[PDB]
């Protein structure tokens, strides 16, 4: 869970960036 | 009559169906996914020797965030996790993953989604490539 977790999260911030 | 549910397990299925042997949101499920497994292979390896798999999803949503960067990645950790099983020959959990990651996603997280206009918010979130 800790794994999806931050993972999930760098795929988010990655995306706001691009946004 | 959960059009929400209806939708979301025809994409999810579709998507894990496909991988393992709405096109709107089909297409930015795959490429946004493949990034995801690609990047994060070993993760994926490691997480998959290891429907339990339900309070992991809904583990990773306990310190009360929710993002579609989560949730496209707990989707893809399910195609990889479909191409397992097809690997293996075990092609007859595909379809009840699906479900249950539906189940756990639209069950939890439905009032997040409805907020975020479903399938629709998904979409122009990842619009940007
Ligand atoms: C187990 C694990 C921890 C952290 C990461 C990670 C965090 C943030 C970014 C951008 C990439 C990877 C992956 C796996």
Redesign the pocket.
Known sequence: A?XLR??G???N??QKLLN | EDDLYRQSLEIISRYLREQATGRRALETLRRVGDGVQR??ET?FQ?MLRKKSFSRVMVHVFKDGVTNWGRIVTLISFGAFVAKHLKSVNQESFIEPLAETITDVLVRTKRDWLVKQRGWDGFVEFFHVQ
């Open positions: 800790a931050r993972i999260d760098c795929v911030l990655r | 990047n994060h993760a490691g």
